[PDB]
């Protein structure tokens, strides 16, 4: 098995489908990564995550460095062994979460100091933490520019991120075992500004990465604006490497992003909203807590192939979620993650068959009916 | 498959091992029933409950009549279909839970009126609710005498329970489909008083039941007293029918109760304490939240055959429970229920082999070391 090999099997417009081969497994693209922030995809055993179709999951440098700790996880055998997921794991670098979740932060050229306990993150420390975790796809340490931002503020922020991208590249390359067994992705910044996105793409390509994330989106800009930025931003990235849209998103966001050349996604929506009673269906989301479901014997979704829809009724799941029962969170989450994976499968198949445009149209007409 | 057939395969002293054959499955005795009060064994899919070795689970008339409702469950196809457990279910009659959980209660010869919403329970209504649920083993509607009680108060209480036992018998027998497909257990009362326990046993035997529960224990009396009462109470029950000790208990309680002739048990301890961080092991319970487990790579128990102990470390489960993660509750609960089932299996095998006395001694020496 290779360290990292991306092959594009088919295209339709800007959309691509293919595979990333890595030592711990193959990732089918476009891919959705369930989020496992605290070394667990919430309410699911890893075997269940796999059974839904997931090829890779996401972990977080920020959360794990605090609890249970990076050195501790390494001492225990690495993140894969610790949580019982033996397939690829992508870890975010901490750059977004530190600014989102920390009470106090101090930003400088060196990195970010923060209070959880006082800690520091820098390109070097982030790469080392991800090494200790045993991440298969390592993200460069970046700065997610707040939205909105003035052109000048976006520029200075993006430029720092690019300097941090080079430092990330160097730290990764200095660690032989990491460079031989893992991959490193760069993160494009530049807010909503075309010239800055271009400068960022140029800087990242000059350094060279295994894949390229579009950072700084899904930060409150809304779908229209996100799509507008993707329209010009994705073509700036190297065509022959994967394109990863961080933190996206709703099913319609995913479809539109694939139409614009994105290959990889992660989002807490299916897990979090599952726990909250929202189930995804081909006819749009439903809230299972609604009284209309109290005696509904149909499964959550009429076409869904998941184990939950094969066995339990809306009425039962309605009862569980109303009662605050853990099994309710389990079943809703398994269904939602399975729904997301089936969406990705339909996307892959339709691109492979040259009918993705029709799929996107059919999907939207029904989902938003 | 027969409606209800109890066969005793082996004995040692007062202990027995055997089988109850019912239409939905065989129950190996002595048996432990996981508790599924809200139509779910908390944090476990039914397939997982079965994988641990459970032959039968317990449901509750009181909880289900309130939420989601007995007529509703019947309309949806019955409790088995609703929750996805196709094997036997025993339902308590509501007599204990109504007095334990209701804010206001009014007791009379007719039954008990209570506030959850105002509701009523009587022998007739209880049997009908259990019919609507589709219970395989139906409990008579009784009164659990508070502890301590004066001899006279215990007597009047037990006598009412016996009148209610006859009414339960008659209501059950009047419902052809229930009488043909389910079994009915009577419940012995009489507090801690030998003469009252005898009068209760005589009354129940005169009426005739498929099995006999020892009621009115595990109500704060402590193990020494519970064992003292079991010493004289169990021999009063018909030898050729199952003996069910309601609400018991800790592993040592179960072993001692089997030594005294009990065949069936139910308790929330393995599930509830699992969620709270207590794991059962052959060397006694441990609290997985304790810092001493933070880097412990051993499984919860060194001998346990469960899926949790085959895959995950104490260190990981410690992290999950500390983090408030749902997977922590899932794994702890699966292990604890599996532990209880392995205890029952060891009990059955040792009685079968005529070495139960030695097992009880060995178990206690190690568990309490
Ligand atoms: N390193 C790095 N990580 C990121 C994570 C993100 N996540 C998002 N969006 C998440 C939005 C969101 C929040 C709650 C529920 C659903 C979706 N945007 C993000 C941007 C970045 C980024 O620029 N750099
Ligand atoms: N119908 C009926 N049901 C009962 C349920 C019981 N449950 C118990 N004990 C439970 C004690 C308990 C409580 C919390 C955690 C563990 C154990 N004693 C019980 C007695 C009766 C009884 O006499 N009649
Ligand atoms: Cl989540
Ligand atoms: Cl429980
Ligand atoms: Zn489903
Ligand atoms: Zn175990």
CSV table of N, CA and C in Angstrom, one decimal, chain B residues 14 130 198 249 285 323:
chain,number,residue,atom,x,y,z
B,14,UNK,N,-30.3,-26.3,47.8
B,14,UNK,CA,-31.5,-25.6,47.4
B,14,UNK,C,-31.4,-25.1,45.9
B,130,UNK,N,-50.7,-5.4,30.3
B,130,UNK,CA,-49.7,-6.3,30.0
B,130,UNK,C,-50.1,-7.2,28.7
B,198,UNK,N,-45.8,-17.7,54.9
B,198,UNK,CA,-46.5,-19.0,54.8
B,198,UNK,C,-47.9,-18.8,54.3
B,249,UNK,N,-29.9,-8.3,41.8
B,249,UNK,CA,-29.3,-7.5,42.8
B,249,UNK,C,-27.8,-7.4,42.5
B,285,UNK,N,-16.0,-4.6,42.0
B,285,UNK,CA,-16.3,-3.4,41.1
B,285,UNK,C,-15.1,-2.4,41.1
B,323,UNK,N,-15.2,12.3,29.8
B,323,UNK,CA,-15.6,13.3,28.8
B,323,UNK,C,-17.2,13.4,28.6
